[PDB]
Amino acid sequence: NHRTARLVAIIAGLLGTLMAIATPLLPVEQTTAELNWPQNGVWQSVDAPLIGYVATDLTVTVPCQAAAGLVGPENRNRSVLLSTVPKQAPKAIDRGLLIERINNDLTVIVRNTPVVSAPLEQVLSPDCRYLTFTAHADKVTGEFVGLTQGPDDDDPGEAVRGERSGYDFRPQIVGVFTDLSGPAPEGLQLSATIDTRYSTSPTLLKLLAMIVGVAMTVIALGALHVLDCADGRRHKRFLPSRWWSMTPLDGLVSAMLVWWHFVGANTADDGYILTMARVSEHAGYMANYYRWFGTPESPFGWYYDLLALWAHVSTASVWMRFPTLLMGLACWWVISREVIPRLGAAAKHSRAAAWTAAGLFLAFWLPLNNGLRPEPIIALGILLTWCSVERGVATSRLLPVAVAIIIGALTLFSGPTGIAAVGALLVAIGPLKTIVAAHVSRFGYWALLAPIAAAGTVTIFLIFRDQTLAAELQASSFKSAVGPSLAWFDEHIRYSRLFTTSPDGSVARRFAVLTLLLALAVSIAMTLRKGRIPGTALGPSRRIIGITIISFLAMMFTPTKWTHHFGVFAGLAGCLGALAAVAVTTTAMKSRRNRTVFGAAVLFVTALSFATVNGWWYVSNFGVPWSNSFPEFKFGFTTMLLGLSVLALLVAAWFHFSGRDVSPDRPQRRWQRLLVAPLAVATWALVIFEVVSLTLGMINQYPAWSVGRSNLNALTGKTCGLANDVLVEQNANAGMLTPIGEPAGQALGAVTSLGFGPNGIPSDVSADPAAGINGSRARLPYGLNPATTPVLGSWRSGTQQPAVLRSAWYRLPDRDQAGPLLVVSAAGRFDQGEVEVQWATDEQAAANEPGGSITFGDVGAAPAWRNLRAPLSSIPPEATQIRLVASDDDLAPQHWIALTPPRIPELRTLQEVVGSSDPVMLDWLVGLAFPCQRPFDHRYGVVEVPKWRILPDRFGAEANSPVMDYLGGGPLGITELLLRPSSVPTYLKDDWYRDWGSLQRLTPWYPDAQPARLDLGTATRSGWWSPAPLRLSH
Amino acid sequence: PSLAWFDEHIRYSRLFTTSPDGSVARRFAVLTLLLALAVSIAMTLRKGR
């Protein structure tokens, strides 16, 4: 109550609003970086892979006598004079630049289309002084400076050139490669300015504007509080009343949250966000790493920098997901201490409301919010927005309304799914009008509405603290043009994915969404039928229902329609659980006909939930019951629950036609007390189902790896993840067994071989990432030496006769210097028991008798080379000599079999082979299971060349690799041209027949290509500056 | 081809395609029927009738 607090509020609020409007347009400081190619004055290939795929400018100028060492005798395999891609790549011709020599003409192919050409003896003339070339976003142009055309289609005497316009013909650069070796001549200057438009930094003026704007916003809200305390009333607390205490229900919810934090399924996007947050410190900005050309997360993701600071202690999965655990605890304590005692007296004194609020909270939290996504932030922000607004209405004060505006604008920019907070923002307009219209008669309009504007615009200092306005606008338009962006009428796709048979449409997610819709419909029907739900307050009940409906309507304007975007309803679900429990009791709903119909509806949506699989994501699915089939004991849970639903309808019809009630009949029993809360029983039954299913998944694979076993190992060191339980053989030529009779040639097909193909495999289908010891000419996988490994086969191009193969006797090693596996490699499509092992002792093989038989098992895509494996625990400890055996059961020419000799591999773990220092190309799924391995960096538009690659399993790799491909951005558009892959044998340490994924080596085409060095500078740019358009690959 | 009772979402998934099954006329008819039914149910709940 002072005039000074009425002047300070106006002045500070207007200054904060002006400094917030001004700050996206203030200058920055770009770091300019260009590539001048001849580094030390010699012909040497360099390696500079650009992340935006193209430079904003390119200029090469080759003299005449540079190409003197390009033609001569027939000892010249030297084709290219200059390139921006390695010529050995399959896609090198239709993506980059070449000044390659076709047989007698020196031509430069740019983006698959020729630009200029000339005969080579005319280039080596004393004319043709240059080979000027230039590339831009509108035209490319080449020119032989010195000569003209001859007797051809063009008239001679026109000074030969070539231009291509009307399309973006800029070449992709992954380095500058060549095929010469001498000292470089004069001239010969390639130059390219790299697009480092996001490598900015604030200037002094922008930094002072951000500091002064935040200070003025704080001073304006302090003056707003001094105005609000004019009526004589003091503080006396901040928190609710029963905050520092525990009950049994709080202990139960806390125990379920902690145990799900350890043995719990994770979401899909955790390695994505962890890899982004790990590389963003060296990059200097927050780039989206797997897609869209290195464009940043432009207004969204203010908290990824907090995750990047949080990850300096350790990158373990129990450490990185600990703020999400704290958000879940805070969310339930806000629900039970602030919302439920606010919704009335019948909601506050009843216990069934508390139990079903806890149940719907856990049923939304557990399948949907165990990760690094922005979903818990948005859920807790919607609750805190509603609680601040609801406290502003009661005490009739404006400062909690301004705090709610700050929190709502803060959670609006967590992710694109944060648009659900506009429900809690739009419901808070009527209350704000009611509060402002009461105070305006003694303070005014400016003094009450300038801190509201300052608090509304304080978030622009957080969005635009690193980027400019032009960068974020053009990047958002470009991401909408390139990537997957569905419109508002494609909202049915989210609900079509909810009803699939996949991890998107599993039991838990489907149950959560259908139970939310049921509780919302019952609350709306009881609000329409009576005036309100009877024992509850009017305003808060209305505002809960309105916020939930506007959240459902606002969720259709998101660019992607996924199923894990329903995790924003985890705070509203406890509130609707309390309302839908009060709306069902005998005090509110008086007829038992209606209560039996509601119980039947609960049973019907529970029946509809179990009509799918118990499927979870990538490695959360190991060992889980019913993870690939419908849950059933003998019939199916869905048919049993449908029968119970029909029986409940028949009981309701008998209640209808008999004309009977309950109030002088059933006072209280124990099952009658259990029966009146259908939502509590259904929600806690599904919560116990989920928790017990992942605990049993952890128990079924105990010596093998599981998610929960790694999270419980992490309490005692061992924070590497899956990298300790994957065995890797580097050299696949090491543990070959030795035969007893003839040497290592024909000893594969020693004693019986009819239909044996030493070159009898199809050369076209059998392919994986001369002369042989068997006379073979086939390609061997996994780095097998053709001079030591014989190959047989069972394929032919004529009429097919049956084939029987029977090997020689192979000596077995000692039982301490032997690995856990016996491996043969095999190609072709065949059945389970086609290839077998036949072990014997010394005297059993001297008598030529079987002695035993085990069968190989297989993991792999057929018909390509794969590894067949069998443990040595299946071979009894008295066996000394083994022998292979094979037979093809007809099935026409397409069916076949290929075979190599037996091998006991010498295995090391993946943490010892792939260390913690080499750059690894991780996929966007394999990020939280491999936390010790580091991804590759990028600093000024140039990326670091990886050495390894880790993939998911085959079903997961063939459906998720189009995120990272060439058509969307992606680092698989760079390594597709620069590097060649090579598979490595890898086995899961105790669950040998499981497809965990795969590992690859990445080898350069030119091994003598050093990294480049860039010439750095500093330029002061403005807030609307833009160097060049963003080229989209189409 | 015989789908079960829990495959009832497939009829609406076909209604929201871009094909002669999900054309303008059929989609308008079904959505207008659902709108009129919801308004009738809401007015029957709110008042007596």
Ligand SMILES: CC[C@@H](CO)NCCN[C@@H](CC)CO
């Ligand atoms: C195609 C993969 C999807 C989800 O499955 N990832 C969504 C993108 N992740 C966002 C941040 C988690 C970045 O835009």
Ligand SMILES: [Ca+2]
């Ligand atoms: Ca055959």
